[PDB]
Design a protein around this nucleic acid. Structure first.
Ligand SMILES: [Zn+2]
Lengths: 165, 86, 74, 162, 68, 82, 79, 410, 76, 85
RNA sequence: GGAUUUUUGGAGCAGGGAGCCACGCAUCGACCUGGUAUUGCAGUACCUCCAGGAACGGUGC
């Protein structure tokens, strides 16, 4: 639900860094809240949390390693649930790290599935090579990479994306 | 006795000069024991009372609308206009 | 110690010299005659102390309770 | 769908990410931007992103307006009354927009309070010496494409297009 | 004799501006009928003064930085 | 006992009122309330370092008024007697 | 809930050092040991002192009965 | 950007703004005749319309009906004329277009908003027929531009001015009838022998506000006319004119003093006498001239306000209350008009029962309440519940019984 | 009083409160008291130096409250 | 009221009203009004007759009032001493 | 009905010189120039250090 952005410079102020993160995430959509603590435990770490996970996945796909205040900010899915996103919103294995389902139309190939799972930094196995070319199974070694991959591929028509839980 | 000193300015344009030096002129439609006047379409001026100024007849005039000025912060009162027809 | 009110302390300070310091920095130090129900003080033969220096004695000065900031026996 | 006073009143008014009042007119696809006077300067930000506005003009008087987020739109031009209409506008995010001409960003040079510039994924920034031209035209702009401008960058930008 | 409506800012971080150009920020634990607010671990802005009690005469305004 | 009755008994009497801010209004007081809210008719009011303005009526509150100087012909002995 | 009057009564029972800022006066504040208080929140300070915010100096005042109108914000002190 | 196509669209919008006003004039040409009769008293060079056609509300042959409404139509026409001149001033100062049209050609959408919108937003918002104003002036109302006493440029509010004059005189001897007689002078009467002095601080402070309110009321009454041109003409007439002339007193100065001759009257402004008056009382004399020009422009409106004040003074209490109610109804209206008891006891009818499913409908007797479960609007109640009309849905009379519907067990 | 009764109905609308210290806080008031004490949520506060900030929740008591500016619909 | 004023801190103003003695009451506007009080109140409100108000702006001045119904708000310190005699 | 949110006030006092521009004191707090430090999942009065500049801002006098 939030795009956690890291590897940023700590020389920027908290309000200026939150405004820069909001201006970077404003291309993907409106931002609900911004978390930017300039303490030594989280120096250089700031993120924007939205009510919808799709805008956060689009922001994590767009502004990963882009030039933001002199440093390449690597943006992925949030490992922790945001206090604003959870309040806007309102199964322990779900969402699992392996998305294995059917109905993968519009020329879904093994190389296309590998290029889609390359956005996930911890992807392990990709199996999309059937006779009907419908069932695809992408398994990742990291939960936060597979969550960002599912948020990026959520809406690629619709197609079925079922976690292996 | 009659207690008409607060009701004579009821629904009439009165200019209450506050203790900070500013004066709000407006249609005070309410009277109370604390002499708190709520002025409808009030105009606030802080420099001086505008009485035929040849140099600048409109200076620091702010339209506050329905602004309720309490009687604790008031310094003086004056008659600046009649009751509005609207 | 024992529970003593500030009104009882101001009543026990009567018959002894106390200084009523106002909000403007000046104080009147004299013998308080009596205390009122609203903690009002009247010091007889009070001497005025302004900015740490004595000014003069004005006699029996009845200081207002809201105007006087503090009352301290000395 | 063209913007109107009823749409401005039905737009959401809440706190932004930097604790600012905003008017959420985003996702409207309005071909002409107008009816900005109904807010009565109660919103410091105007979010009209992902719209179909071609020329950035028609804005009404707003003394308390500070941000104008019009990113992911088809904004290929900017009006000449930018300094007269939004002199207190500090941020104007036009990321992934239709900004191509260098003269289209010439109207953003007159905004003296403008400091944040986010014009990424656009053809105006892809031109030759585009950042130097933007720094030369807008010396008051501190952030351009999420990058700070220094005195060495100002001395480098003062040579070309002087 | 009515009490001040500080139930939303109770057990929450709020900063109240006092007289003399000072501010006290802390967690409010209660209030009084004369708007006397007790803030535990208040900070005078800086340095903290611990548990403080502010009278309602100098209490001008209070703004909460948390959820109220 | 109280000066509020002596202020309220000074109707249709010419006196001066110096405010707490320093404004001086001289004129005939038409009526005063119990909380020293005196309404004066045809009272000329002058602020500090400014020209005076003539008004038909002027209401002065008791908190913002510093001192009410009554006239020498005002019956203060009759006003103090209850 | 703990009231400010209850906290002042607990401080007067403990006889510890408490400092109260002066209303409309940021230069000087009162401090001392509370022995008791009245119904109008006027605390009686034993061995009172005038703590300076800028000068950082204390002037001896003794037993001072300060009215509650001059109190702006009262807290405890270790010294 | 296509500048020639933008200029063609601006010319089409100007033609549509002319045609939309032509359709409004053909629908009600009485407003144009009233505006021409109002502008004939201001500008004399313009030609006048036909008197019989303006009386019958006709342009050539067709007589239009009577249409608050005239003020709203004048404000909408002024807004349309401000929009037309702005679009005129905007435009006053091929192969590549055809090749770029093929990009993103696979779009299932309709594009028919090129030139029809300018006519649709200017045609005299409403669904079919709810307002005579267009979409640009759909929120326009005369309540924020006129007071209750004026009633959409039909009268004037002089009671506040009379009370301000009484407060300036610092007495209670001023009545309602004397103020309208005293203000009737405001060409040299109000400068030399007026009701109040020319340089009084109490009188002039109310007089400047009264002149500004009279100019605002005249602008609200002639918003369809050229207000800026009328202000420029009134300034040019005062700049050209020496206007106040006498047989023996010659020319007076608005100083409040006369001159022996016109040679002395021109040289008096270069001395220290008239120059201090012109430097310290230019705004007061300009406000007096604007108040006199507004009173001359709306002297029929001032006479109507005086007649209404005289009718309210000479009427009774009930007649004045009825006149105030009629004025309020005119001001706050739209522009365009549009058995025994043993049966009651021994049948259960003494106790009434309501069913929550049928919109909480109350029926007498338990028989009708249990006969709700086979009904028509109560069947719409189960349709709103989402449970099908079954015996289990019939057995419950509450809304919470829909959680045990067909999509609960199988 | 009449003003104490009229001030309590100002909750839920966009109104401003000007304090005696010069702070003007304009926003949607959650509730208002009879002694000119108002609590607002999602408001903008302007200082005497021209600085404007945004507050998620504010509460201005009547001890240092100078005036309250409400909408023109409550005047009629 | 009367029993509090005769014996408490208002006893100086009560004795001045009883013996027609001049008292110097300092006002809050940097002035001091010296004169006899014709009456007294609970809130130290006195109607002063022949009150001379001396204010320092420090230049000594004087303003004389034959009658002055002074409000009890501005009264800060009222020094009662042998000034009439 | 002189004890904090309304009326018996915690308010008074000090703002000018020099040549169309700059200022007397203390305190707190954003900041500009370069080097360096953190690769960290946080809901926050406020948070890296060294070096220079401050014609920077608010408060009382
Ligand atoms: Zn039923």
């Amino acid at each position: 639900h939030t795009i956690y952005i890291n590897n940023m410079n700590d020389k920027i102020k908290k309000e200026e860094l939150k405004r820069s993160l909001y201006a970077l995430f404003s291309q993907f959509g409106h931002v609900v809240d911004i978390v930017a603590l300039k303490t030594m435990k989280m120096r250089g770490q700031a993120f924007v949390i939205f009510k919808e996970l799709g805008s956060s996945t689009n922001a994590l796909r767009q502004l990963q390693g882009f030039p933001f205040y002199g440093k390449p900010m690597r943006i992925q899915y949030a490992k922790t649930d945001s206090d604003i996103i959870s309040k806007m919103r309102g199964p322990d294995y779900p969402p699992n790290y392996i998305l294995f389902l059917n109905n993968l139309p519009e020329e879904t190939n093994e190389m296309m599935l590998s290029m889609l799972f390359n956005q996930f930094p911890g992807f392990k196995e990709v199996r999309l090579v059937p006779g009907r070319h419908d069932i695809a199974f992408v398994e990742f070694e990291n939960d936060g990479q597979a969550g960002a991959a599912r948020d990026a591929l959520q809406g690629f028509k619709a197609m079925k994306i079922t976690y292996a839980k | 006795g009659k207690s008409s000193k607060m009701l004579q300015h009821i629904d009439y344009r009165m200019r209450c000069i506050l203790q900070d030096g500013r004066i709000f002129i407006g249609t005070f439609k309410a009277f109370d024991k604390h002499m708190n006047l709520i002025l409808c379409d009030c105009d606030e001026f802080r420099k001086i009372k505008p009485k035929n100024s040849k140099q600048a007849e409109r200076e620091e005039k702010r339209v506050l609308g329905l602004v309720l000025l309490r009687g604790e912060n008031l310094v003086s009162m004056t008659v600046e206009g009649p009751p509005p027809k609207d | 110690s024992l529970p003593l009110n500030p009104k009882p302390f101001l009543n026990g300070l009567t018959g002894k010299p106390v200084m009523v310091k106002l909000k403007w920095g000046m104080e009147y130090k004299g013998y308080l005659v009596s205390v009122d129900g609203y903690m009002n003080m009247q010091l007889a033969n009070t001497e005025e102390y302004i900015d740490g220096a004595l000014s003069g004695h004005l006699g029996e000065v009845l200081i207002r309770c809201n105007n006087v900031l503090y009352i301290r026996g000395v | 769908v063209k913007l109107t006073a009823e749409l401005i009143e039905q737009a959401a008014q809440y706190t932004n990410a930097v604790r600012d009042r905003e008017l959420d007119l985003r996702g409207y696809k309005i071909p002409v931007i107008e009816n900005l006077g109904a807010t009565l300067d109660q919103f410091d930000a105007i979010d009209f992103s992902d719209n179909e506005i071609r020329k950035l003009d028609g804005f009404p008087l707003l003394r308390r307006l500070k941000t104008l987020l019009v990113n992911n739109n088809r904004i290929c031009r900017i009006g000449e009354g930018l300094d007269q209409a939004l002199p207190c506008l500090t941020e104007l995010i036009l990321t992934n927009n239709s900004l191509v001409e260098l003269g289209d960003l010439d109207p953003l040079a007159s905004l003296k309070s403008l400091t944040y510039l986010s014009i990424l994924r656009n053809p105006v920034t892809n031109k030759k010496h585009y950042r130097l031209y933007v720094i030369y035209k807008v010396p008051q702009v501190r952030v351009l494409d999420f990058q700070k401008v220094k005195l060495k960058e100002r001395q480098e930008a003062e040579k070309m297009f002087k | 004799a009515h009490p001040p409506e500080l139930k939303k800012f109770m057990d929450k971080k709020l900063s109240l501006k006092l007289n003399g150009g000072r501010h006290v920020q802390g967690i409010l634990r209660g209030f009084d009928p004369f708007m006397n607010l007790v803030i535990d671990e208040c900070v005078e802005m800086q340095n903290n003064i611990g548990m403080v009690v502010i009278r309602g005469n100098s209490i001008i305004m209070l703004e909460a930085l948390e959820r109220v | 006992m109280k000066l509020v009755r002596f202020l309220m008994k000074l109707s249709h009497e010419t006196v001066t009122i110096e405010l707490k801010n320093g404004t001086q209004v001289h004129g005939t007081i038409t009526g005063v309330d119990v909380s020293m809210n005196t309404h004066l008719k045809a009272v000329k009011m002058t602020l500090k370092n400014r020209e005076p303005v003539q008004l038909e009526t002027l209401s002065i509150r008791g908190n913002n008024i510093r001192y009410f100087i009554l006239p020498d012909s005002l019956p203060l002995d009759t006003l103090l007697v209850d | 809930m703990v009231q400010p009057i209850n906290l002042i009564f607990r401080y007067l029972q403990n006889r510890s050092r408490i400092q109260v800022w002066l209303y409309e006066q940021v230069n000087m504040r009162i401090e001392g040991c509370i022995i008791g208080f009245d119904e109008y929140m006027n605390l009686v300070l034993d061995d009172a002192e005038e703590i300076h915010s800028k000068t950082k100096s204390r002037k001896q005042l003794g037993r001072i009965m300060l009215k509650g109108d001059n109190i702006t914000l009262l807290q405890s002190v270790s010294n | 950007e296509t500048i020639l196509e933008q200029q063609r669209r601006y010319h089409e919008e100007k033609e549509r703004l002319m045609d939309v006003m032509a359709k409004e004039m053909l629908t009600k040409k009485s407003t144009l005749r009233d505006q021409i009769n109002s502008d004939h008293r201001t500008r004399a060079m313009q030609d006048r319309y036909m008197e019989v056609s303006g009386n019958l509300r006709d342009l050539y042959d067709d007589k239009d009906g009577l249409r608050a409404e005239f003020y709203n139509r004048l404000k909408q026409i002024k807004e349309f004329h401000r929009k037309h001149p702005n679009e005129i001033c905007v435009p006053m100062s091929l192969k590549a277009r055809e090749n770029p049209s093929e990009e993103a050609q696979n779009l299932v959408e309709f594009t028919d908003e090129e030139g029809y919108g300018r006519y649709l937003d200017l045609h005299d918002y409403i669904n079919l027929k709810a307002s005579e104003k267009l979409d640009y002036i759909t929120y326009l109302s005369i309540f924020d531009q006129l007071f209750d006493i004026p009633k959409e440029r039909k009268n004037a509010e002089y009671k506040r001015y009379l009370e301000m004059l009484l407060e300036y005189l610092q007495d209670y001897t001023d009545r309602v009838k004397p103020l309208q007689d005293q203000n009737e002078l405001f060409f040299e009467k109000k400068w030399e022998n007026g009701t109040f002095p020319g340089w009084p601080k109490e009188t002039s402070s109310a007089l400047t506000h009264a002149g500004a309110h009279l100019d605002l009321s005249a602008f609200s009454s002639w918003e369809e006319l050229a207000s800026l041109g009328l202000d420029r003409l009134k300034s040019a007439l005062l700049a050209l004119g020496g206007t106040l002339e006498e047989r023996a007193q010659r020319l007076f100065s608005t100083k409040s003093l006369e001159s022996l001759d016109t040679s002395l009257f021109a040289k008096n402004p270069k001395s220290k006498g008239t120059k201090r008056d012109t430097e310290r009382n230019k705004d007061i004399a300009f406000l007096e001239a604007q108040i006199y020009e507004y009173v001359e422009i709306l002297g029929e409106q001032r006479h109507l306000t005086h007649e209404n004040v005289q009718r309210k003074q000479a009427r009774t209490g009930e007649e004045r209350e009825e006149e105030e109610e009629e004025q309020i109804s005119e001001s706050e209206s739209e522009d365009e008009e549009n058995i025994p008891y043993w049966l009651y006891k021994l049948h259960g009818l003494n106790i009434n029962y309501n069913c929550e499913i049928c919109g909480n409908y109350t029926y007498r007797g338990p028989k009708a309440f249990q006969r709700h479960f086979a009904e028509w609007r109560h069947a719409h109640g189960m349709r709103c519940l989402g449970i099908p009309n079954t015996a289990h849905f019939a057995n419950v009379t509450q809304i919470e019984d829909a959680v045990s519907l067909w999509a609960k067990l199988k | 009083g009449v003003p104490i009764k009229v001030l309590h109905e100002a909750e839920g609308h966009i109104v401003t409160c000007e304090t005696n210290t010069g702070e003007v806080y304009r926003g949607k008031l959650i509730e208002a008291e009879d002694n000119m004490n108002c609590q607002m949520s999602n408001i903008t506060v302007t200082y005497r130096d021209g600085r404007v900030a945004q507050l998620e929740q504010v509460y201005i008591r009547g001890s240092k409250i100078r005036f309250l500016i409400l909408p023109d619909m409550l005047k009629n | 009221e009367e029993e509090e004023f005769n014996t408490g801190p208002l006893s100086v103003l009560t004795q001045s009203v009883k013996n027609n003695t001049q008292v110097l009451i300092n006002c809050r506007n940097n002035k001091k009004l010296l004169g006899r009080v014709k009456a007294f109140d609970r809130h130290c409100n006195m109607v002063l007759e022949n009150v001379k108000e001396m204010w320092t702006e420090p230049v000594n001045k004087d303003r004389y009032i034959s009658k002055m119904f002074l409000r009890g708000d501005s009264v800060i310190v009222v020094l009662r001493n042998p000034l009439i005699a």
